[PDB]
Structure formats: structure tokens, C-alpha cells
Amino acid sequence: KGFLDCESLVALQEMALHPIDLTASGCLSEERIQKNSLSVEGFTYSYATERVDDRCLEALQGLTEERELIKQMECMQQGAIMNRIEGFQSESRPVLHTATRAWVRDQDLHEEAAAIARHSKEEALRLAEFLYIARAKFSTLVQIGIGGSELGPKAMYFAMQGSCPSDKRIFFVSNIDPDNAAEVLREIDLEQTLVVVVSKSGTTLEPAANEELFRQAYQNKGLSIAEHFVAVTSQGSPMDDKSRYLEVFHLWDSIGGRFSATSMVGGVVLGFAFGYEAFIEFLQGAAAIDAHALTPKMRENLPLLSAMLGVWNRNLLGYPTTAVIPYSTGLKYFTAHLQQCGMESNGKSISREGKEISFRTSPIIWGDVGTNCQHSFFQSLHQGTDIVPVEFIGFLHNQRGLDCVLSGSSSSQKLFANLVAQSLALAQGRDNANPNKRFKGNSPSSILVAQQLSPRIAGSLLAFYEHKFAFQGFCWGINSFDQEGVSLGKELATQIIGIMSEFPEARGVLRLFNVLT
Amino acid sequence: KGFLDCESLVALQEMALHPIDLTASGCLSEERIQKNSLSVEGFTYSYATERVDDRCLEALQGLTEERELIKQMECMQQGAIMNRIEGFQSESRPVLHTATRAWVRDQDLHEEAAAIARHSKEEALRLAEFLYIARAKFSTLVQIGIGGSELGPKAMYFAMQGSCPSDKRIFFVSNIDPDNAAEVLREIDLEQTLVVVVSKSGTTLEPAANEELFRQAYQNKGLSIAEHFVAVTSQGSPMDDKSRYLEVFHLWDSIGGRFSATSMVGGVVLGFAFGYEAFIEFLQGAAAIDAHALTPKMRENLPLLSAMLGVWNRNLLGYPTTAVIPYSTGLKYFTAHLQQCGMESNGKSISREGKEISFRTSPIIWGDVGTNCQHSFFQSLHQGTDIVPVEFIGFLHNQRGLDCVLSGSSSSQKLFANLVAQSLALAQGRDNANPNKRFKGNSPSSILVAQQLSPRIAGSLLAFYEHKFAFQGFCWGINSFDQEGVSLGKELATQIIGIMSEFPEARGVLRLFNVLT
Ligand SMILES: O=C[C@H](O)[C@@H](O)[C@H](O)[C@H](O)COP(=O)(O)O
Numbered sequence A, B: 001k002g003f004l005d006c007e008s009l010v011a012l013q014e015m016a017l018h019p020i021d022l023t024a025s026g027c028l029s030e031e032r033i034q035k036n037s038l039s040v041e042g043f044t045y046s047y048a049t050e051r052v053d054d055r056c057l058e059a060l061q062g063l064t065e066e067r068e069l070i071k072q073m074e075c076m077q078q079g080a081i082m083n084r085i086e087g088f089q090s091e092s093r094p095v096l097h098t099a100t101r102a103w104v105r106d107q108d109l110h111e112e113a114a115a116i117a118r119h120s121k122e123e124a125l126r127l128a129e130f131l132y133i134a135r136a137k138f139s140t141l142v143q144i145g146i147g148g149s150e151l152g153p154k155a156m157y158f159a160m161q162g163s164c165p166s167d168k169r170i171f172f173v174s175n176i177d178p179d180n181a182a183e184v185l186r187e188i189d190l191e192q193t194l195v196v197v198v199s200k201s202g203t204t205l206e207p208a209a210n211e212e213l214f215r216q217a218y219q220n221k222g223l224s225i226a227e228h229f230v231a232v233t234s235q236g237s238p239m240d241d242k243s244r245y246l247e248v249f250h251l252w253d254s255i256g257g258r259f260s261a262t263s264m265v266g267g268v269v270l271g272f273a274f275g276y277e278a279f280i281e282f283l284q285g286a287a288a289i290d291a292h293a294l295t296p297k298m299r300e301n302l303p304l305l306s307a308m309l310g311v312w313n314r315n316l317l318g319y320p321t322t323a324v325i326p327y328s329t330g331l332k333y334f335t336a337h338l339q340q341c342g343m344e345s346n347g348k349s350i351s352r353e354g355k356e357i358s359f360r361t362s363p364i365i366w367g368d369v370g371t372n373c374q375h376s377f378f379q380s381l382h383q384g385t386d387i388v389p390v391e392f393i394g395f396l397h398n399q400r401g402l403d404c405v406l407s408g409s410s411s412s413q414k415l416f417a418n419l420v421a422q423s424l425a426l427a428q429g430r431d432n433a434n435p436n437k438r439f440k441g442n443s444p445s446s447i448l449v450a451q452q453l454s455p456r457i458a459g460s461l462l463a464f465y466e467h468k469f470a471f472q473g474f475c476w477g478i479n480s481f482d483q484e485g486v487s488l489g490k491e492l493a494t495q496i497i498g499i500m501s502e503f504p505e506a507r508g509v510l511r512l513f514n515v516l517t
């Protein structure tokens, strides 16, 4: 039964007419604050500030059943062909980023999923061997890569920077804009630098242009070049070449780029920065959420609940965006990665059966950290014309151990308290005789908290959102795991290269070129 | 005549029923590419890829007249009381960020505007005197401040980093999250560090907690403390204290935080990084756009056209967001600042007359750089269910002089060509027999280009968006220049401090606190 044809969706459309009024006096009771929460796998998740009541949550639970979300999650994790469009040409392959960490806890994986799990284990032990030497010889790592090859690793590197002692200097060169390469080359000692070229296909324009820029810089300084370059690419890729790289690590075709941070795409840079054992802790955190995401009761399942609350906000209440708001300096780059992972996966408008859909899929994912956000665009959340649902992320304790007692509390406490106060304020609002000072409220939010950001918790948070977006795709019935819009971008890049050294831009591009130059 | 009561808006509502079809064969003609462009003040602006035709642009021009946008811009720049709500308590003051740079070109300013202009000139010469010494004594500057006191300066600092030689190390400490302070303290030599505390009010929790954290670090290392701390604050503020700071610079009450990057809020950090003359070039670029924004014909006026095209997309076509996409590493932080400046200014739902409005104001402002964006959320722009209007920003040349010829073109060229190809692709789309590979098109965008990012161009780009948002506020008839939502945030912060050492969160905050800990 397709998305719109499920009985539970029909019930939810009636409920969406009159969602609970979070501004009614006494609505945010102790009972509701206790009931609408879940504490498991090192987190507490509170959603008393979402516009949901027990009737709504029973039907959302029915929706997960009618759409068989748990069965699809198993199928994905066990190795079924989830990346495909029936009736038409498509990639037609499994979706196996969970298998890149499944091997750190005993599991019964078969066929393609088992092969990915054992190859990941073989890669990781090759990484441990490699890092013993590399962390002794190099002070500096430069990751060349774009999209899924940069954002996940970069978000995870800054997430862990506060927990793991390290003297390594770490840079990311991604844009074909050569100013990106120049800013990094300005800063580094090449003799001390390990360059990690990360490209699944091995053929993306940006890593290839950037790698060539760095190869020339080594040759200009008169340094042996191959001794400094490591590749991370798909097996059998044009880049899978041990005569051109000091070492070569592999992912595989069933490892989506935007899901590859737990593969060697993240393993090399994270392992070099913080040491092997920290990367394993990161993997254990992800694998623990992989196992938890099979929990059948929505109310007892973090990614499944977050997915269905998102579906409530997006399709039933009609809000076209979601703001992710981490109260966490370490998570400064996490929203940018989530924005790719959610919008690239679920920014689709055809079903896995090839039919054009009549509902909306991925919302715009955007956001920034607190408390900074309270001084800027929170103005519009509190008093603008459009409701923006918020996902707050916070921690009870800082990573780096520096804090200060002022007026009876530490700044870690002030940080968390600000998050709580804003969620309550967004949900309840404030009357006022002055219209300039009134707050209508009923702007929904959830709160996810762990004790402290760590490698393990970073891994759990990553896997949490990976499965949230997968569950939303499974519910919508779309293919979350290809990206024909991004393939088109790479094809445009090939053609504009040929045009500057036929296709439907050419006549347009030429005339634009004349008016802009 | 209010927004909805203007005749031209009535005409535009009829036109919005059937906007031009950018996917119709031959629609993006040479005539249309020439006609729908504007090249002035060092930029070219192309909007042939917006869903507008001559009928629509004539009526939008009528809308600027009926709403008297040019007269309101003059009033703002000349010093009139634009920050006020009639009928109710409000801040009731002028809006004079333009006067902080007006003094670099001859002008006829009177009364409050003239006073701000001459005090800005007096501040700048005090800055030049100060920088001669400070750039000789310190290698490192740390800006402590949040919101308008950080984002604008930070966006401008990275914008200019590629053009101006500098050995200064520059950090921003903003969040009350003490991990922010800790990451910076981990990196700097305090004896070599100048700490610039930037806070207009002088009372915001975050700068005050952070300044105290840094004062203790100096005292722990046993260093003379006052010799290293500079203040930037409103005149007569609690911080305006030459016995507590090595030096004190001023802005004034009519200088909005989100418009303060051209005041000493940006002047100190920019002047220290790149030298005085670079800050003056930045001011000249802004002042040049201030003068240009008085041009009465919408089609001959960059910020007025961009504002009205935004109003077309937001209110007439109904798109609730705008993506700002800079093809520019130097502009990596520009979208975050624009997001504050637009959403905090225009995230309002009452008129300057105190009436609740019946239309939508600020959209969500979000985005990231190209070409990275082509590999991530551009998937949703090309094939998701919701139209997102795009503002592309690009340059013909890189800042840092490093580039490479590959297959007949430089990477600067590949960078620009990718931008052009994507705008055309978003507007025209692509049919396909395979539904997974078809692109519906008609997704609108504009293109703003300068020869090269520079201090001057950075200043023009900043002023461009400041006036875009002002023109949109003038058109909507809202007060763009206060922020009662942000005042509420600071009030919540005061109260949660007292609660941890009455108000409508208290009972809610306590029970949340129990469920999350
Ligand atoms: O799922 C991720 C997307 O396909 C995209 O972001 C991809 O990661 C980049 O285009 C880099 O691709 P390569 O790793 O193949 O260079």
C-alpha cells in the first residue's frame, strides 16, 4: 500500500486539522514531559514540544506498520537491492553502509552484506597497520574530495576534535575553486603532509583537478611525490592504483557517498587525527544505533520516531523546512552534512515504482549552532510568518574541560538551559498587549541530549540521522540511495569543459557568457 | 497605501497565475539574456533565469513607486526615525549604518546622520593611529562577540583574506559554549594576542562570560591583563571604560548590530588583519552602493531589483525560501551573515503601524558554496518536490593567483562555467523517457558577478544585501530594524541564570530538566 493509500495516513489527515495547542495553559504538564520522551543508547529524546498527542502517535505507529518500515530497514541492512527503480534503467544495487561497521559487534550477515563486513574489517586492520607508521612520519593531513567524500568526514573530525588529544593539522580541499587549494597550500609543510585523495568513482573533476594541483606543488618543491599521496576509492576504480599512491584504501559500490563516513572515507582522516582506537569507538557508536533501529515500536526507536515526527511536520502539518540546531561547538559542521544526507537522499519526486508522486518529500534542511542562533534567525522562528520545526541537539557536559562558575552556574549549564528555555518558549509563546512583543508559539521542536560528545556518541548521532532519512524514504516509497541530479551536475561539468576546449545548455551558456564578461 | 492595497500588487497577482515558462523552447534567447541584465558598480546582474517578463517587471516597478521605496531609502540614509512602531512602545530611533561609511565620499548629511558620519571619521582616524602600534606588537587577534558583533566581521574577514597579504592569526569566540573559548585558547600565544571584546549593549551574557574566561587565562599565565583587551561598544555603555581596556572604540544606538560590519565592529579586526587602507577600501565599496541604491528605476538599481525579484518569488509565486550560492571560497561565511541580516530584519509579522499582517515576510535564507553544492542538496533543487529560488554569486578571477590549465581551461573558468550551466539547467530542465532522469526546470535564479573579490567588492556586496533587505522591509511595510525575538532570547538567558542561582518557562523548564538529566 503506497504512502497516501494507507489507512493510518487517512486517520492522520483528520488529526492534522486540529493539532494539539501547545500554548494552552497547563498543556506542557509533568505527565506529558515524562510520557513523550525516550532515553536509550546514551541519549534522551523529548518531544513534548511537538504538536502530537496520543491519538496522533498511535496512528503514526500504524503508519510504520502499514508501510513496513522495520522490514525495509532489515532488508537494507541484510543486503537486499534497495537502490533501484522498477520499470526503468537505474543503479540496481544493495545499500550497505551499515555493513562497514557491523563487524565490530557479532552479527549474522549473509551474501553481499557479509562480504562488505569482512572487507571493511580487512580494510580497518590495514588502516591500523598504516597509521602506526603514518602518524609517526606526518604532522599534516589534507583530504582532497567533495560532497560525500568531504562533508561527513569533516563533520566527524570537528565533532571529535574536543575529545581526542591530537597535534595533527587537518585540512579539506574540495571546491574546484583553486582558492581553496591555495589557502591550504599557504599553510602546510609539504614534506610533513600526507595527501589523502578520496573519490569513490575516481573520476570526479574536483578531486582530480585538486590532486593535480598538489602533485605539481610537490614537484615544484622538488619532493618525491608518490610517497605523500594516499587514495581512497571504489575497488577496481581508475584510481585503485598502488603504483600511483603510497597506499590505497577501498570502499565499494553499495556504499553511498553521503553514507560513507564510517568507511575508509572517514577512517583515514579520523584515524590519522585521533589514532585507530578512536575510529573504532566511532564505529561502535554507529553499529549500536544500526542494531537499535530494528526496534519495532516507534515510541521505543530513536531514528524511527524522529522520522515519523518529521513526516508529521512535513506532510501532515505542511512545514517545508527543518532547522537542526546543535548547542555544540564540536557539531559546527554537522548540519551541513545532514543537509546533504537528507536532501540528496530524499529530494526526489518519483516512487521506487517509477510513478510521479503527489506529495512532498525532503524538506529544506538548514540550521546553525546555539546559542548564536538565538541572536540571529531565531527572530523569525519566534515572530516571523512561517513555522519552522526545530531539532535541538545538546549535551550536559563540554568536551574540552574548560569552564567557569558565574552567578552559581557553569557555562555548560547556561548552554543547556538556553536550549531548554527556547524550545519551551517556541512551543508555548507569550501573550502581550504590545503586538511587537507577543509570541504566538505553537512552533514545534524536539530535544536530543547525550552526556558528552565523544567518538562513540558522534558515531551514534551520525547513524541516527542516516536511519532517520532512510525511514522517511521507506515511508514515502522513494529511492533514497541514488542521485540523478548530482550525476547531471557532473555531466554538465564534463560538457562545459568540452565547450571551453551539441548539449541543451550550449546556445544558452554562450550568450550568458557574453553578457557576464 | 499598504502592501496588499497597491494597484500594482493587484496586477501582479493576475500575472502570478501564469508566469513565463522558462522551459519553452527558445525562451532563453539572446534578446532576453541581454534585456534582463544590469551591469553597474563593478557587477553584472543577470535575471533571464527568473520567471519574469516585461509585463511583470513594469508592474514591479510600479510597486516600488506606490510603496515609495526610494523615498524611504532616502529617509533612512538622511536620518529619519525608521526604527519604530506607531501606536505602541518601541525603540523609536534612526537607522544609520550608511552614515558609518558615508564620510568617504562627499555628501550632504544633516542632524543625526551628519553626527554619525563625523564620529565615524573620528573613530577611523583613531583606528589608523591605533593600528600602527597594534600591528607591530601583536600577531593574533581574538574577537569576542556574538550575533551582529561576530557574523558580519567574520564573513568580511574571510572574504578579504585572499586579497590582502597578512601574517595575523584571527579567531572568533562567540558561543557561551566554553568549548568555543577552549579551542581558541589551545591555539594562541596570549602574550602575542590582542583580545577585542565587541558588544554594542555591553551587557550580553556571551561576550561577558567569554571576556571573563580570557581575563582569567591571562592572569593564570601571570600577564598584565588590561594591556591586551580592547573594547568596541556603544557610547556611554557599561563597557565604555578606558580604565578597563587598552583602548575603546564606539558605535552608536542607531547602528544595528546586523548592519555594523562597516563600523568599528568590523573596523578593528579587519584593520588589524589587513591594515587600515584595506578597511577604507571596504568602506568605499559600501558607500558606492549606498549612493547607487537611490537610483529610481528598479531595472537600473541592483538592491532594488534584487528586492523586488525576491518579493515576486516570495509573495507572488509563493516560494518560502531563498538559497544564496557563492561560487567563492572567500565567501564561505557570507551566507550565514546574510541569513542573520535578512531573517532577523524581516522575520516580522506586524506592520510599522502595529497591525498584524496577512502576507508572508522574510523567507528562510540558506545556502552554501559552489561547486560543492552541486554534489549535495542541488539534488533537491533539480528533482525534489519544492521550488527553491537561487541567488548565484560568482567571479571571473580567483583571489590568490594559483591556478592550472587543464584540457584548455583554468579552474577559475571551470568554476564560473559550472555556475552558468546550473542556472540554465535549473531554469530550462530536461525531458527524458526515464522519469528518474528528467528535470522539470522552471526553478528560478539570478547571477551576480564581479571581476574579482576584493575589499571594495566585499564592501559593495555587503551593502547590496543590506539595502535589498531594507527595500523588502519598506515594501512589506514592516520594521526591519528591531528584534524583539532576540531581546526575548536575552531575557530568557537572564531568567535561566536566576533559576540556577516566576517566569512562564519556570515550571516547564524544571520538569524538562528532570527528564533530560
Ligand atoms: O552520495 C554522495 C554523492 O554522490 C556526491 O556527494 C559524491 O560523493 C561526490 O560527487 C563525490 O563523488 P566521488 O567520491 O565519486 O568523487
Ligand SMILES: O=C[C@H](O)[C@@H](O)[C@H](O)[C@H](O)COP(=O)(O)O
Pocket (backbone or CB within 6 Å): A375, A376, B146, B147, B148, B149, B198, B199, B200, B201, B202, B203, B204, B207, B256, B257, B258, B259, B483, B486
Ligand atoms: O542586530 C543584531 C542583534 O541585535 C544581535 O545579533 C546582537 O548583535 C547580539 O545579540 C550581540 O549584541 P551586543 O553587540 O549588544 O552584545
